[PDB]
PDB file of C-alpha atoms and ligand atoms in Angstrom:
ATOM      1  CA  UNK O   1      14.861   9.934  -1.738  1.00  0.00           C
ATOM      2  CA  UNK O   2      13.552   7.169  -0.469  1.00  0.00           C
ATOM      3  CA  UNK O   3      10.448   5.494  -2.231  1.00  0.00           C
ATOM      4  CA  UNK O   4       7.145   5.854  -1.123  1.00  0.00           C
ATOM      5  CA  UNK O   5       4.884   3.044  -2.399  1.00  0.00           C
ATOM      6  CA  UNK O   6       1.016   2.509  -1.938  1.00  0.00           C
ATOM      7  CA  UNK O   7       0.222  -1.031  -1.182  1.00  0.00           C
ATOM      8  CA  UNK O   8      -3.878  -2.057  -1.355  1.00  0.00           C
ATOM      9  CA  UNK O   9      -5.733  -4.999  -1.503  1.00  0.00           C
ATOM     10  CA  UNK O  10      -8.653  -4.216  -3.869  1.00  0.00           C
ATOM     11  CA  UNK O  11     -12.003  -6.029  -5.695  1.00  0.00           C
ATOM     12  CA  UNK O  12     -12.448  -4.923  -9.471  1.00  0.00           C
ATOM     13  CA  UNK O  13     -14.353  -3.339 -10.984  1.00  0.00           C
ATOM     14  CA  UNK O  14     -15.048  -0.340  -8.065  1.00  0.00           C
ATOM     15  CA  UNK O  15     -11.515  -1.165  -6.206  1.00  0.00           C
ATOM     16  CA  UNK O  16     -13.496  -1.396  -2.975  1.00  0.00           C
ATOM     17  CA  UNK O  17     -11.404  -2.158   0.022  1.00  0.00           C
ATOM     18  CA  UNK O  18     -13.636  -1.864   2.984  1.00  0.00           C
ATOM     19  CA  UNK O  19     -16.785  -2.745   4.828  1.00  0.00           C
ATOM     20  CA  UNK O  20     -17.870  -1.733   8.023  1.00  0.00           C
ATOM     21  CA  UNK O  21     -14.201  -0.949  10.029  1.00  0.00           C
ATOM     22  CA  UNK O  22     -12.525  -3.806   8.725  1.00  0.00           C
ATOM     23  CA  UNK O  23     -11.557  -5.820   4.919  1.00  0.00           C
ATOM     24  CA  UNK O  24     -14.488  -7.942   2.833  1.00  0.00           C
ATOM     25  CA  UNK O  25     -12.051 -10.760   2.755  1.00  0.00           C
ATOM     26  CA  UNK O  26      -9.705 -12.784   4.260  1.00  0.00           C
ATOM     27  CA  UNK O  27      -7.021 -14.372   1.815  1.00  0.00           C
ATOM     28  CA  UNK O  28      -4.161 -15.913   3.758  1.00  0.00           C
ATOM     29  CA  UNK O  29      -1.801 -15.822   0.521  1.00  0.00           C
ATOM     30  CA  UNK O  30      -2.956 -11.762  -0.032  1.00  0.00           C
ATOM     31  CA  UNK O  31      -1.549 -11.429   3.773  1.00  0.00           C
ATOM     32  CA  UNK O  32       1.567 -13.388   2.736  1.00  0.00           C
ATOM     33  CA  UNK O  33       2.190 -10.996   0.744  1.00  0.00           C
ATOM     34  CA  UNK O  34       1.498  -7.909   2.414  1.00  0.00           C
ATOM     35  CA  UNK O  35       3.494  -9.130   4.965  1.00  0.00           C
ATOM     36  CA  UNK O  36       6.420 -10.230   3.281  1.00  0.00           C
ATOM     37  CA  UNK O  37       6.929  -7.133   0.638  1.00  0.00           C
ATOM     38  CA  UNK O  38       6.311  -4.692   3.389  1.00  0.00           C
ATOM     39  CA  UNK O  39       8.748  -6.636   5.924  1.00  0.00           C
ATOM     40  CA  UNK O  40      11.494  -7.313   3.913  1.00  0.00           C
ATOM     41  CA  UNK O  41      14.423  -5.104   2.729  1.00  0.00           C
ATOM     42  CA  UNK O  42      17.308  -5.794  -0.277  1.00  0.00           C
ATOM     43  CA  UNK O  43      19.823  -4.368   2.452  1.00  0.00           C
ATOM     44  CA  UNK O  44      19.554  -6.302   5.690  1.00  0.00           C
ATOM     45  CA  UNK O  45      20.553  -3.408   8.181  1.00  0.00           C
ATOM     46  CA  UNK O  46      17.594  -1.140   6.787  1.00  0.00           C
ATOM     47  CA  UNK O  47      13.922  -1.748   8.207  1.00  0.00           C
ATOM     48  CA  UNK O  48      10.649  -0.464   5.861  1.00  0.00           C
ATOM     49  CA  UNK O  49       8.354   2.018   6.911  1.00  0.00           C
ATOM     50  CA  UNK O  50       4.343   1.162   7.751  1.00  0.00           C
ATOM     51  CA  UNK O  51       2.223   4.236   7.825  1.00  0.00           C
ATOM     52  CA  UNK O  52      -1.572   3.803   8.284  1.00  0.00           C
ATOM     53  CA  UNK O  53      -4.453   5.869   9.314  1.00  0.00           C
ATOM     54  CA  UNK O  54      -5.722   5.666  12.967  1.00  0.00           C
ATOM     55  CA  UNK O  55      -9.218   3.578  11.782  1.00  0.00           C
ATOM     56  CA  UNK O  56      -7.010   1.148  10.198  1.00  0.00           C
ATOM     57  CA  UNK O  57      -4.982   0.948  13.203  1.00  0.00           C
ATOM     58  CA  UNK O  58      -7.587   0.327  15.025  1.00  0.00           C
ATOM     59  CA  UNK O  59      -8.881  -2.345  12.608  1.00  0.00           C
ATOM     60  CA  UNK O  60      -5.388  -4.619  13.088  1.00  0.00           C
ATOM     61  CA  UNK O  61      -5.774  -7.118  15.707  1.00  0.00           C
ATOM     62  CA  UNK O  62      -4.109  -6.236  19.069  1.00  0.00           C
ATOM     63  CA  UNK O  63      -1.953  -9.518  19.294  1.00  0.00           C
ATOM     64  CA  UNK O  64      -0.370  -8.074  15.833  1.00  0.00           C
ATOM     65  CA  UNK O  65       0.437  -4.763  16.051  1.00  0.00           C
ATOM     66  CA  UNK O  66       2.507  -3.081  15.578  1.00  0.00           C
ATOM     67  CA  UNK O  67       3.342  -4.973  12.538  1.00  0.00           C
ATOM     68  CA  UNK O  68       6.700  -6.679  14.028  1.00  0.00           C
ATOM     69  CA  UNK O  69      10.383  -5.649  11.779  1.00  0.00           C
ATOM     70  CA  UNK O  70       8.275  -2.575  10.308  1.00  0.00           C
ATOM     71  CA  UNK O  71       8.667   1.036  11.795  1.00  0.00           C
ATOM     72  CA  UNK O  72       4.767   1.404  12.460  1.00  0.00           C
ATOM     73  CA  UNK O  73       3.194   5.221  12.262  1.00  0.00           C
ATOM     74  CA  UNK O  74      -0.174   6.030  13.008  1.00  0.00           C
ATOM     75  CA  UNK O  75      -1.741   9.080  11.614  1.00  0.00           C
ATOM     76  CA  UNK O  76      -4.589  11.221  13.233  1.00  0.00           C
ATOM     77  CA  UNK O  77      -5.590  14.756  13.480  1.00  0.00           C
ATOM     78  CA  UNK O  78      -5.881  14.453  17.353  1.00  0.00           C
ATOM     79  CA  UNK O  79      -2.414  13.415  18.014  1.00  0.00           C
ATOM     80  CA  UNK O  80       1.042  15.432  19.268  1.00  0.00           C
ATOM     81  CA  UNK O  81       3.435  16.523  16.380  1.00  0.00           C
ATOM     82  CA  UNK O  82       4.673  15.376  13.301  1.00  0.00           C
ATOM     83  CA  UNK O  83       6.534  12.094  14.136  1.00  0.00           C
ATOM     84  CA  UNK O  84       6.698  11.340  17.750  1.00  0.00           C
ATOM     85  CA  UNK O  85       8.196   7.712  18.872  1.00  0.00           C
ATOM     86  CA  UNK O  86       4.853   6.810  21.609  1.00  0.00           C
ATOM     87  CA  UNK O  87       5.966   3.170  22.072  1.00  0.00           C
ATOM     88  CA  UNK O  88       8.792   0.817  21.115  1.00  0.00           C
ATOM     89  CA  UNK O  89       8.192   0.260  17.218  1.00  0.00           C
ATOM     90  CA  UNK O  90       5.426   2.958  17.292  1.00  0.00           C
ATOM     91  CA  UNK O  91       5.632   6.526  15.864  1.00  0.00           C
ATOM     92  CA  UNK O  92       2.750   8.806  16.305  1.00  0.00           C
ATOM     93  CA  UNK O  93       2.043  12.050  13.664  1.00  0.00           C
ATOM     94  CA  UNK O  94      -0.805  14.064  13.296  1.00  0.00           C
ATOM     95  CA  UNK O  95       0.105  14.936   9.733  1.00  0.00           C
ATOM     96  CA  UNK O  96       0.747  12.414   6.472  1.00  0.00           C
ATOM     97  CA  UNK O  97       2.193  14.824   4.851  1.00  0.00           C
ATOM     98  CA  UNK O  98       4.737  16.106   7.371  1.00  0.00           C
ATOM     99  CA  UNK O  99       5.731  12.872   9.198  1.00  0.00           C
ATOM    100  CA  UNK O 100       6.774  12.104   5.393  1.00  0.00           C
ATOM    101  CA  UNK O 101       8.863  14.615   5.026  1.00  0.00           C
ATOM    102  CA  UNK O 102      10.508  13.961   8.540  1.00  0.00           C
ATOM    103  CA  UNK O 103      10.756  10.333   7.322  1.00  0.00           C
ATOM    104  CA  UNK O 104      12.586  11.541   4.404  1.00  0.00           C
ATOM    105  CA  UNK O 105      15.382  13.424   6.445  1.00  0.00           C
ATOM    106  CA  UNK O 106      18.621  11.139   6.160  1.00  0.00           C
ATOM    107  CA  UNK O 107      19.982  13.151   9.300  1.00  0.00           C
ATOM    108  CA  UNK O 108      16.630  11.524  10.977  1.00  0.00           C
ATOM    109  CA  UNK O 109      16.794   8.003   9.221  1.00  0.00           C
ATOM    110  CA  UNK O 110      20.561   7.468   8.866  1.00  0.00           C
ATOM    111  CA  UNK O 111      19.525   6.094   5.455  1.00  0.00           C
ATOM    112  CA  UNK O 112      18.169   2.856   6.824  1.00  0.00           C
ATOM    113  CA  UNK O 113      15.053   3.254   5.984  1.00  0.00           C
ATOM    114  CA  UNK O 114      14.805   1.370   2.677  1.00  0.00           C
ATOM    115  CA  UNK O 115      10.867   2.331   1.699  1.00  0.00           C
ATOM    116  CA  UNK O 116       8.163   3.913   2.933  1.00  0.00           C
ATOM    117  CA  UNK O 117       4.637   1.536   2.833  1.00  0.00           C
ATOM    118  CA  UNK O 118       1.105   3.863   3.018  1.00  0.00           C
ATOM    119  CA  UNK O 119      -0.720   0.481   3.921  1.00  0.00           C
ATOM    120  CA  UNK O 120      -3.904   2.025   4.026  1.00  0.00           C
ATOM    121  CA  UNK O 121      -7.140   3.467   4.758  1.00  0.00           C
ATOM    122  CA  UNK O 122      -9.254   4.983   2.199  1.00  0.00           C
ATOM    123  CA  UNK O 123      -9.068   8.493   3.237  1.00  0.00           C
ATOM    124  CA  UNK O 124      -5.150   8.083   4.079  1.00  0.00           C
ATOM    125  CA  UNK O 125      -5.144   6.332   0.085  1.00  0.00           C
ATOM    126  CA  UNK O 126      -7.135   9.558  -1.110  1.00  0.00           C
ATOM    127  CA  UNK O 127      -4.792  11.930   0.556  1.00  0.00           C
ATOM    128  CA  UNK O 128      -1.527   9.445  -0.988  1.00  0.00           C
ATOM    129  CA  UNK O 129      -2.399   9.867  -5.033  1.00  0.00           C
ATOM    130  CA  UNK O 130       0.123  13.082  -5.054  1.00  0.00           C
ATOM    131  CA  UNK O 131       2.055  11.443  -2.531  1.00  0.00           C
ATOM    132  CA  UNK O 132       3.146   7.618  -3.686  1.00  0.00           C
ATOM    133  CA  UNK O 133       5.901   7.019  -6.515  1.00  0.00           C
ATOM    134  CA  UNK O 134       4.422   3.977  -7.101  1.00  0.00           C
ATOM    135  CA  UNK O 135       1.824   1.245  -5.617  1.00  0.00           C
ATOM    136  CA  UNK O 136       1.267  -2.287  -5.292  1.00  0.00           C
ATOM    137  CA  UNK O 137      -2.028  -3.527  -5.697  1.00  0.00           C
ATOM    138  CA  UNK O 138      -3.812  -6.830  -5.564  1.00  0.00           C
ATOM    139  CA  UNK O 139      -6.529  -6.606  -7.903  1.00  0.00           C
ATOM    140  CA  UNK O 140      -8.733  -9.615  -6.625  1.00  0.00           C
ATOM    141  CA  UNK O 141     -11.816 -10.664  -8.853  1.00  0.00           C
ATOM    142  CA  UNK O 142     -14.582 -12.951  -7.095  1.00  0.00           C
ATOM    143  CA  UNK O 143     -14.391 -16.223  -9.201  1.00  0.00           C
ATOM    144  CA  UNK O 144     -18.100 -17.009 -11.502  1.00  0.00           C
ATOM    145  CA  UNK O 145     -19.551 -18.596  -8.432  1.00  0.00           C
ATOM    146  CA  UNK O 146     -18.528 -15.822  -5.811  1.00  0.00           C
ATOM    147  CA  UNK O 147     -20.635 -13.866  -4.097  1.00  0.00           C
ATOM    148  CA  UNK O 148     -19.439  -9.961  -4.807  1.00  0.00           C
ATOM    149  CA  UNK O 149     -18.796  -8.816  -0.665  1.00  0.00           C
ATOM    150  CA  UNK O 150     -20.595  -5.952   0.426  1.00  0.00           C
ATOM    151  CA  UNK O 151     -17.979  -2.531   0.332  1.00  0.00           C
ATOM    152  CA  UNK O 152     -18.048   0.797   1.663  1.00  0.00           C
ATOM    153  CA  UNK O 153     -14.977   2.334   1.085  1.00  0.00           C
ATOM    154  CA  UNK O 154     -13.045   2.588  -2.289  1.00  0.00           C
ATOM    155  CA  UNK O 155      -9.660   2.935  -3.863  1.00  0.00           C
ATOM    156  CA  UNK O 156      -9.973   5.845  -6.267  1.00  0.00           C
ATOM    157  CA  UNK O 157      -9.714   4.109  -9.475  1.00  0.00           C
ATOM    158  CA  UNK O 158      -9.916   7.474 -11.338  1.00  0.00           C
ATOM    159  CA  UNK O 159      -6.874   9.684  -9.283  1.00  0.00           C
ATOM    160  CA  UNK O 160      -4.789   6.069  -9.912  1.00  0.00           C
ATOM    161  CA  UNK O 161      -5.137   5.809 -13.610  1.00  0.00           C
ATOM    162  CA  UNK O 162      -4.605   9.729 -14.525  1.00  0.00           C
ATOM    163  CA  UNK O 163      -1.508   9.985 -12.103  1.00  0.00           C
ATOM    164  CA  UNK O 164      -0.171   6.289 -12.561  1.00  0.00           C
ATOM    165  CA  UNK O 165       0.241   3.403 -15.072  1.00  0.00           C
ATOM    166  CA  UNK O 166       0.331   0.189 -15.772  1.00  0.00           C
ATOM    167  CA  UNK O 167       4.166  -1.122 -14.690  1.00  0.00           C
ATOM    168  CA  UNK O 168       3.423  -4.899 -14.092  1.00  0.00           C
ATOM    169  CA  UNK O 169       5.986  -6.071 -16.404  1.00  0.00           C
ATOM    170  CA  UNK O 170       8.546  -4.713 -13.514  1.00  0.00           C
ATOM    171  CA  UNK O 171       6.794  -6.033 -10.718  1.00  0.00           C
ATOM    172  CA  UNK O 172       9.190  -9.072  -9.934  1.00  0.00           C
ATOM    173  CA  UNK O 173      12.150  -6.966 -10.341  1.00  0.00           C
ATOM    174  CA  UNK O 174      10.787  -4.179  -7.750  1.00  0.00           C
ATOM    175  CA  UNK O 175      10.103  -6.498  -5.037  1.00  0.00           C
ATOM    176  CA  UNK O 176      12.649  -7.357  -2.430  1.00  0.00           C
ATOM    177  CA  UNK O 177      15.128 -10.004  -4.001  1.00  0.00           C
ATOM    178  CA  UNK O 178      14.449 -12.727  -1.889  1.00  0.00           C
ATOM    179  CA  UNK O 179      10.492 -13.091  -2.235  1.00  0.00           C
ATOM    180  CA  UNK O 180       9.800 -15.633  -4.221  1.00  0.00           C
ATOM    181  CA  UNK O 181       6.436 -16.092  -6.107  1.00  0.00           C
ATOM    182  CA  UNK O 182       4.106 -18.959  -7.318  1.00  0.00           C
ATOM    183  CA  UNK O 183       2.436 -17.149 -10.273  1.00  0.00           C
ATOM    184  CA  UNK O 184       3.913 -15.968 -13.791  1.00  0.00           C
ATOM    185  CA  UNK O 185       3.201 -12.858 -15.417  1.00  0.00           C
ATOM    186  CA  UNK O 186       0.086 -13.046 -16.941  1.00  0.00           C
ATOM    187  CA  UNK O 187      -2.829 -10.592 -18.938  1.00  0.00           C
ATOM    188  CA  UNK O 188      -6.191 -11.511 -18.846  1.00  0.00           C
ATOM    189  CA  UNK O 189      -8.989  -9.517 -19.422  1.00  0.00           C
ATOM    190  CA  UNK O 190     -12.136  -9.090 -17.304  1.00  0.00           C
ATOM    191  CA  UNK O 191     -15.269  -7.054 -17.369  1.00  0.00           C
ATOM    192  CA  UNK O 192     -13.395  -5.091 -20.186  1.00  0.00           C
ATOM    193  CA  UNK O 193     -10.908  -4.110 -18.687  1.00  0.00           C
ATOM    194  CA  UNK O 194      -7.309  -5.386 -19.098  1.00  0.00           C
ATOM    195  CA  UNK O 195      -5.547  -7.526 -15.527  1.00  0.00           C
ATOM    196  CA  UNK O 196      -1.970  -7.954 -15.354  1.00  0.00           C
ATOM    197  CA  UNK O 197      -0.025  -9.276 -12.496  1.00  0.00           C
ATOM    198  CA  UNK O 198       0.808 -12.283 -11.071  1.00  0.00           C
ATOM    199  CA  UNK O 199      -1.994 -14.167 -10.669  1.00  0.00           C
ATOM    200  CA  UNK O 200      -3.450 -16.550  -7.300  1.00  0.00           C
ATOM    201  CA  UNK O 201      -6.117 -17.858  -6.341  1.00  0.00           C
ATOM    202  CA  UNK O 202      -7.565 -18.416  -2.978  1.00  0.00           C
ATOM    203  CA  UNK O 203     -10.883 -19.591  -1.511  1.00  0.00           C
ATOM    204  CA  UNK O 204     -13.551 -18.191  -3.976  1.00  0.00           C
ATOM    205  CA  UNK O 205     -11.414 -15.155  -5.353  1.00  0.00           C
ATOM    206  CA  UNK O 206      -8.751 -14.775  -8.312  1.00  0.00           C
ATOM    207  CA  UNK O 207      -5.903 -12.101  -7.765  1.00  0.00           C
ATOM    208  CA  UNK O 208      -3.161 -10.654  -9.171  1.00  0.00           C
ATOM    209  CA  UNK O 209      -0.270  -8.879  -7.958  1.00  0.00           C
ATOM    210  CA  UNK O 210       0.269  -5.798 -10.015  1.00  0.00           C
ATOM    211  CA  UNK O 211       2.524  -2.597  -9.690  1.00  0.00           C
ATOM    212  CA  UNK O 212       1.613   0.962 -10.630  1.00  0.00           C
ATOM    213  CA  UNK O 213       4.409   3.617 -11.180  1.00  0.00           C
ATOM    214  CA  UNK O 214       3.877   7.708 -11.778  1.00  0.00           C
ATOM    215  CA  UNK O 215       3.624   8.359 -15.508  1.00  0.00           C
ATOM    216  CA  UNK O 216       6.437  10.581 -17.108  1.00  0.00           C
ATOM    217  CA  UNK O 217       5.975  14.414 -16.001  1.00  0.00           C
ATOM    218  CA  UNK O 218       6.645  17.374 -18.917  1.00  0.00           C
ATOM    219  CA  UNK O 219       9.136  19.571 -18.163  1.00  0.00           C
ATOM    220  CA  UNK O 220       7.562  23.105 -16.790  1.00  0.00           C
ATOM    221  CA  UNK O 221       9.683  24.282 -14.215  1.00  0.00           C
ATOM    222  CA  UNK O 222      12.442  23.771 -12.309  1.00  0.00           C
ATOM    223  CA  UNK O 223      13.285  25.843  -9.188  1.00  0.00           C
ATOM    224  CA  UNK O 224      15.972  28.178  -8.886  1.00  0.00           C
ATOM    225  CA  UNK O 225      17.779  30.425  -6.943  1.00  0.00           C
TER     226      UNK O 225
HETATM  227  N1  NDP W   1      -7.886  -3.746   1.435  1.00  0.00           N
HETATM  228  C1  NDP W   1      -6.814  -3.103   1.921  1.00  0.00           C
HETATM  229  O1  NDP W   1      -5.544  -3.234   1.327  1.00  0.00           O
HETATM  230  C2  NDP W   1      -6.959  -2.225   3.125  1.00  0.00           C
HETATM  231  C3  NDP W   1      -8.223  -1.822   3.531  1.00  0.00           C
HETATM  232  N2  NDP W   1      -8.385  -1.019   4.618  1.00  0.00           N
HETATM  233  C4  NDP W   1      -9.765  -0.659   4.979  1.00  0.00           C
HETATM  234  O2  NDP W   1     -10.024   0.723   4.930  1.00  0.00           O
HETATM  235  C5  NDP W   1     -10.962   1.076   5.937  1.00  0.00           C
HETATM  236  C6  NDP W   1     -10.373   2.179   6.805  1.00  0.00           C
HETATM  237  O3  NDP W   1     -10.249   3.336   6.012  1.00  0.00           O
HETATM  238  P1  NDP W   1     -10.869   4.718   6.525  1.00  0.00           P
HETATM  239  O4  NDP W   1     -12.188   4.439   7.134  1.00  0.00           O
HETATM  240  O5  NDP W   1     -10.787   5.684   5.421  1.00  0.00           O
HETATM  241  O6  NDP W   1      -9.845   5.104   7.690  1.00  0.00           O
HETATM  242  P2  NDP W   1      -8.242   5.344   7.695  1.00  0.00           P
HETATM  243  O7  NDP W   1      -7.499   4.106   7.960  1.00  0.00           O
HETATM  244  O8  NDP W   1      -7.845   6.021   6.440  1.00  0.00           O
HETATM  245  O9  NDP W   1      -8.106   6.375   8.916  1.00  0.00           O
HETATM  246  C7  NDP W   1      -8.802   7.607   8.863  1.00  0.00           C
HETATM  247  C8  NDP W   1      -8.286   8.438  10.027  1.00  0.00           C
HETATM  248  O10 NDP W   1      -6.913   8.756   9.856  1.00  0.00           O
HETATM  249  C9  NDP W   1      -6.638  10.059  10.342  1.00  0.00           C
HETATM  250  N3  NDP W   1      -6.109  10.903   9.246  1.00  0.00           N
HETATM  251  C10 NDP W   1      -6.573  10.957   7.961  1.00  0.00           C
HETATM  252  N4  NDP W   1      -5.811  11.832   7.266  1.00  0.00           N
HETATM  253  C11 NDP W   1      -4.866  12.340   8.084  1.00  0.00           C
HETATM  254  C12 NDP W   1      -3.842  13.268   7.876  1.00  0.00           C
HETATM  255  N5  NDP W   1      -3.654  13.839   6.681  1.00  0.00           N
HETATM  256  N6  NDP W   1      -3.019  13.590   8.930  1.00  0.00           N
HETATM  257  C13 NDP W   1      -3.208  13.013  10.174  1.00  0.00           C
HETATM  258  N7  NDP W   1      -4.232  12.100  10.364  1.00  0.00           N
HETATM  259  C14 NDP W   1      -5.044  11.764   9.335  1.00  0.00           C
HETATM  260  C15 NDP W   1      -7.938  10.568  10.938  1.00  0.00           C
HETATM  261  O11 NDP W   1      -7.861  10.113  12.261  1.00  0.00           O
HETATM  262  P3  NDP W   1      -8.611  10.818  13.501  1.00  0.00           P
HETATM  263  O12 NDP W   1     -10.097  10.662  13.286  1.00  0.00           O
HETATM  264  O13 NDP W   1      -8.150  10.103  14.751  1.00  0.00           O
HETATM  265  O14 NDP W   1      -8.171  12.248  13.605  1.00  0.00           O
HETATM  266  C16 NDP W   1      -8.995   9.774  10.191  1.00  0.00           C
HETATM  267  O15 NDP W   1     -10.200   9.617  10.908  1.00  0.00           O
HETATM  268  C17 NDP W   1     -11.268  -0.170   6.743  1.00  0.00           C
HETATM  269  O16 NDP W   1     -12.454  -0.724   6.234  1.00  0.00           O
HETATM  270  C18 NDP W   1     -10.115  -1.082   6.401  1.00  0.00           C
HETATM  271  O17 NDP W   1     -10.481  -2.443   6.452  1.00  0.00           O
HETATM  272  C19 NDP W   1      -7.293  -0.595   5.354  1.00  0.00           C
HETATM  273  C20 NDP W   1      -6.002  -0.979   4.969  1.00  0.00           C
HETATM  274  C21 NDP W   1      -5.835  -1.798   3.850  1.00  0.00           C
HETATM  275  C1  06V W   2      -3.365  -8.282   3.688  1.00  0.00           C
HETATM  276  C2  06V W   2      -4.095  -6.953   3.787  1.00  0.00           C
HETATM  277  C3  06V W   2      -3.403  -5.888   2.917  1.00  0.00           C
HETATM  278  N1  06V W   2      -3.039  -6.234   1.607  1.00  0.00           N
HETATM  279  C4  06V W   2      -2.413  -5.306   0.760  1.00  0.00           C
HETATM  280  N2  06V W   2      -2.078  -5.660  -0.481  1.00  0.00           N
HETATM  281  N3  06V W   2      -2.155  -4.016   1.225  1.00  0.00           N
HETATM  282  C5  06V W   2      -2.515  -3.650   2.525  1.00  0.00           C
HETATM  283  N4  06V W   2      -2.255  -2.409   2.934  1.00  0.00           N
HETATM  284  C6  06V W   2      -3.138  -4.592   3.363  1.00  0.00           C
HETATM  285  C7  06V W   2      -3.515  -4.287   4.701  1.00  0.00           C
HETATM  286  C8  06V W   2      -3.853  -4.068   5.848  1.00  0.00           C
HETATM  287  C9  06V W   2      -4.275  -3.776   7.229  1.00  0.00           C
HETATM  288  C10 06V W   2      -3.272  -2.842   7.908  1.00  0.00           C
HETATM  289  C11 06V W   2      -4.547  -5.052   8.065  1.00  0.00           C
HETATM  290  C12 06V W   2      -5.888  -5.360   8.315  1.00  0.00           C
HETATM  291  C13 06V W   2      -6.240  -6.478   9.072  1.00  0.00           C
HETATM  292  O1  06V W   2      -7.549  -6.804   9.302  1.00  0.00           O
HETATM  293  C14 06V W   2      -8.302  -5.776   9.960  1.00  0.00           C
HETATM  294  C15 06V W   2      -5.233  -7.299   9.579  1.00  0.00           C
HETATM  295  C16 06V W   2      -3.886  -7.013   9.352  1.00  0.00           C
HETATM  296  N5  06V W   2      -2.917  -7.905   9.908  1.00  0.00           N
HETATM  297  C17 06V W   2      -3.388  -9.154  10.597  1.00  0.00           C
HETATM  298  C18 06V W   2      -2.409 -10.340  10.462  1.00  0.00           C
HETATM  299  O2  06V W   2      -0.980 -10.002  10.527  1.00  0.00           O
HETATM  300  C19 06V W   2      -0.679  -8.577  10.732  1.00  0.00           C
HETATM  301  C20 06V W   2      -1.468  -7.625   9.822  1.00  0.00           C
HETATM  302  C21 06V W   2      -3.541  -5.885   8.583  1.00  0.00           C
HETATM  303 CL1   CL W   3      -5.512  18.114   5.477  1.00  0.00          CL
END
């Protein structure tokens, strides 16, 4: 009931989002971003939900995690149960898929939970395709005189576009009221394909802010009793 929404940073045309442990770039206004969508709420008694893989846990400097106003949960095979509070502001599951449905429980939550961020990892964004009712991704192309960073882990492009379209034209309207943004809604194409979003740039990179939402399902069962 309550939505869960992929949020990526990723370099067209091969959505790469990785190198070596940590991101290929470092765009202040991309962090703005991140930071304010997954912080803020429309209803200002309910906190968002972070959930990352351990590796990108890992990856987040130590003087900023957890992420501060976000419930933070780390995910890895090695640890206790399926959601189990380790720290102040720290949740600890061994499962994606169950300490999702214990998020989900409004008996658990109290409905003030308002949504549910995957922020990342490629294998947690592999294992979130079936998962995620929508995502936000920052499609960032290296400007003509940019220097295409080295990448060794991938969004997958393919699972995204069979599962998901296109739903840019709501992007302002599914972010938390009070962001505000410097871009309007533009389309552009580039190497073929079609980019639209809101559109920055930043240091030798073009981006644009762009939302993806599940395409509509036929009707082939319904479960009863
Ligand atoms: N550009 C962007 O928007 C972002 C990019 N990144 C990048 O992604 C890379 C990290 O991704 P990746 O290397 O795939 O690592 P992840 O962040 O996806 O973490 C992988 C680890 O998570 C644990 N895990 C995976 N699936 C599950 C599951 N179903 N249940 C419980 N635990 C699970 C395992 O931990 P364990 O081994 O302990 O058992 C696994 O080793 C980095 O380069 C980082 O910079 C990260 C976030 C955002
Ligand atoms: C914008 C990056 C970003 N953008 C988008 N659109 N989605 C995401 N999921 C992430 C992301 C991310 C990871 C968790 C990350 C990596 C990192 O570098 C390893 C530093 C941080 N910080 C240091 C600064 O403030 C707190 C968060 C977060
Ligand atoms: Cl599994």
């Amino acid at each position: 009931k309550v939505p869960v929404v992929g949020i990526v940073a990723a370099l067209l045309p091969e959505m790469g989002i990785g190198f070596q442990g940590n991101l290929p770039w470092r765009l202040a206004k991309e962090m703005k971003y991140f930071r304010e969508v997954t912080t803020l709420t429309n209803d200002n008694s309910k906190q968002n939900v972070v959930i990352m893989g351990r590796k990108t846990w890992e990856s987040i400097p130590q003087k900023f995690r957890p992420l501060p106003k976000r419930i933070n949960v780390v995910v890895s095979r090695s640890f206790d149960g399926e959601l189990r509070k380790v720290e102040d502001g720290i949740y600890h599951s061994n499962s994606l898929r169950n300490c999702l449905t214990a998020l989900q429980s409004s008996l658990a939550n109290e409905n003030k939970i308002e949504r549910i961020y995957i922020i990342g990892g490629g294998e947690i964004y592999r294992q979130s395709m079936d998962l995620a009712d929508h995502w936000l991704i920052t499609k960032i192309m290296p400007l003509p005189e940019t220097t295409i960073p080295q990448m060794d882990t991938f969004l997958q492009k393919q699972e995204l576009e069979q599962r998901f379209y296109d739903n840019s034209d709501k992007l302002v309207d599914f972010l938390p009221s009070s962001i505000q943004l410097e871009g309007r809604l533009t389309s552009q194409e580039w190497n073929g394909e079609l980019v639209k979003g809101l559109p920055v740039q930043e240091k030798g990179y073009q981006f644009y802010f762009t939302l993806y939402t599940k395409k509509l399902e036929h009707h082939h069962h319904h479960h009863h009793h």
